[PDB]
Design an enzyme around this catalytic site. Structure first.
Site, PDB file in Angstrom:
ATOM      1  CB  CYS A  61     -13.488 -83.155 -28.009  1.00 50.45           C
ATOM      2  SG  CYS A  61     -11.455 -82.232 -28.787  1.00 50.45           S
ATOM      3  N   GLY A 117     -11.875 -77.456 -26.040  1.00 51.60           N
ATOM      4  CA  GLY A 117     -13.363 -77.458 -25.691  1.00 51.60           C
ATOM      5  C   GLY A 117     -13.936 -78.074 -26.945  1.00 51.60           C
ATOM      6  CG  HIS A 164     -10.302 -87.677 -27.457  1.00 50.42           C
ATOM      7  ND1 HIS A 164     -10.848 -87.526 -29.069  1.00 50.42           N
ATOM      8  CD2 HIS A 164     -11.376 -86.358 -26.410  1.00 50.42           C
ATOM      9  CE1 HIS A 164     -11.091 -86.270 -28.936  1.00 50.42           C
ATOM     10  NE2 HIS A 164     -11.936 -86.131 -27.866  1.00 50.42           N
TER      11      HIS A 164
END
Ligand SMILES: O=C(C[C@@]1(C(=O)Nc2cncc3ccccc23)CCOc2ccc(Cl)cc21)N1CCC[C@@H]1Cn1ccnc1
Ligand SMILES: [Cl-]
Lengths: 302, 298
Positions: A145, A143, A41
């Site tokens: 991820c 942030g 993503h």
């Protein structure tokens, strides 16, 4: 003596954390050899998240669209491929700090350490477990991820988790390092809810054995139980069914303390019935379920 | 979202852990530049008399699979400073800091110079740490990382009969009224770190837990009268000032949060939890709450 929620030393993992930027999106990547692994993503905007066609978004990307940063050094992306929900960015430099590593998929109830990172920079380390509902009760801000979950057995880092999303209840969903999600979760901003959570029974039992090793026997009783009667009681308190495998896995802890697994099961039954009555077990007023039998043997003995 | 007991990344400290052996005793050492710091009980008491009988070659220092040759040795309070021939290439930017009770830090627990785990813990008001240590863990260190600098604040020396731990700063000065000697030593009566419980209540509000809030406020004196009754540390005006940023972020004045605490102390949780806990957590400082609920990196 003493019983703490202990994470593995994060050093081997810190030396793998890089920042991955694709357009406006910036998250973390795991740099192992000449490959950087990160959530796919990273190619999406907030708009794309409703119904993203990842193959279509990725086919429009070239190597130079992915800005990879290891400390104050930019890495050149020389290739890219997708493996399930992870993007594998081939870089021109192999990570000199690459440790001995394996990608392992864990089962619910298993614990691991999380190195929480923001902008490719490790900010903290904590211990957590894969919940039976396939979510993790983590601590993650935007942030984060691409932050990873790992265990270190001897000198080898076993990567088991990469962070991808926060569910509406504040819990977190991610994948193994091959891009396969834990749970029925998808990397989509769609209506997704974490299933009803249950207590990891084998872990609570293991933690009760840790309390016995540390000299806490107040919760023990003269009773035993059958596996089936324990599961009938446990299910009413939203406890995971204890399987024969769990009983076998608890064998060493049972032998060390001299308390049979079904005898410890009866203590748990009584604890569920009575509560603690102002008492604690290993400094806790709740029954701890995020220590596996292996964690207990590791911390209480070696 | 999420609130966990979070330690600092241990990487900068891992690269300093060495094994120190003197005779039959084996413990951990902290290798910074060309010196290895470790508990002075590794020679074991008259420590000047035991140390004067030791030569450099009596101390076997091991950094991984490499033996370091000790070229000198001196003692600074309860810490032994072993001068080695090689400067640690992995030496980070560091400071030796002495912490105050209530302050938290990360502990890299080690056995035979090998880091095995990392956990967060606080210096208890009674100067002990509720740690997790087995035999061979002596020399394991306590630290905080501020930007790129590791602030070493603790070196583990011993376990008290209640299972709690005692140690020194990196200059060899013990925290608390302890001695490095096998003698009748007991941890004093412990108290709850009040400023930390308040900070943890603010973390619960940030994470969407407001059940414990009330319309009430209190004076600092009335709160201190109630707190002292439940073995809580006196809340000072400095604590009130330190909680300012959290009071501004959540819109709940510090004395307003103290009134929530007063009601929790007199009435309990009533089958409810706060951040998944049935007890009031006191091992998160106001800074830890801000750092975890902001995402500060190292
Ligand atoms: O959408 C997402 C991430 C997201 C998610 O869950 N994030 C977060 C993760 N961890 C902890 C969090 C704590 C607070 C807030 C957000 C958090 C948002 C919610 O919807 C979803 C749904 C599914 C998934 Cl897999 C991801 C997400 N991102 C992250 C980069 C790219 C993309 C689009 N994008 C761009 C710029 N900001 C966001
Ligand atoms: Cl597993």
């Amino acid at each position: 003596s003493g019983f703490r929620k202990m994470a593995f030393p994060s050093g081997k993992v810190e030396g793998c954390m890089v920042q991955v930027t694709c357009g406006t999106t910036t998250l973390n990547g795991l740099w192992l050899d000449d490959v950087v692994y990160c959530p796919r993503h990273v190619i999406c905007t907030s708009e794309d998240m409703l119904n993203p066609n990842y193959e279509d978004l990725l086919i429009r990307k070239s190597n130079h669209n992915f800005l990879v940063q290891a400390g104050n050094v930019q890495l050149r992306v020389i290739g890219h491929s997708m493996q399930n929900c992870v993007l594998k960015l081939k870089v021109d430099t192999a990570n000199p700090k690459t440790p001995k590593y394996k990608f392992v998929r864990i089962q619910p109830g298993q614990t691991f350490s999380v190195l929480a990172c923001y902008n490719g920079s490790p900010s903290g380390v904590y211990q957590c477990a894969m919940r039976p509902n396939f979510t993790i009760k983590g601590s993650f801000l935007n942030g984060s991820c691409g932050s990873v979950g790992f265990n270190i057995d001897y000198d080898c880092v076993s990567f088991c988790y990469m962070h991808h999303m926060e569910l509406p209840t504040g819990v977190h969903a991610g994948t193994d390092l091959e891009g396969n999600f834990y749970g029925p979760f998808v990397d989509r901003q769609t209506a997704q809810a974490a299933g009803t959570d249950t207590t990891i029974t084998v872990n609570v039992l293991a933690w009760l054995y840790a309390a016995v090793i540390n000299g806490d026997r107040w919760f023990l009783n003269r009773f035993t139980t059958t596996l089936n009667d324990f599961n009938l009681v446990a299910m009413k308190y939203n406890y995971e069914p204890l399987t024969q495998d769990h009983v076998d896995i608890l064998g060493p802890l049972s032998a060390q303390t001299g308390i049979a697994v079904l005898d410890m099961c009866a203590s748990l039954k009584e604890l569920l019935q009575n509560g603690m009555n102002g008492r604690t077990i290993l400094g806790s007023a709740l029954l701890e379920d995020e220590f596996t039998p292996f964690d207990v043997v590791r911390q209480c003995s070696g």
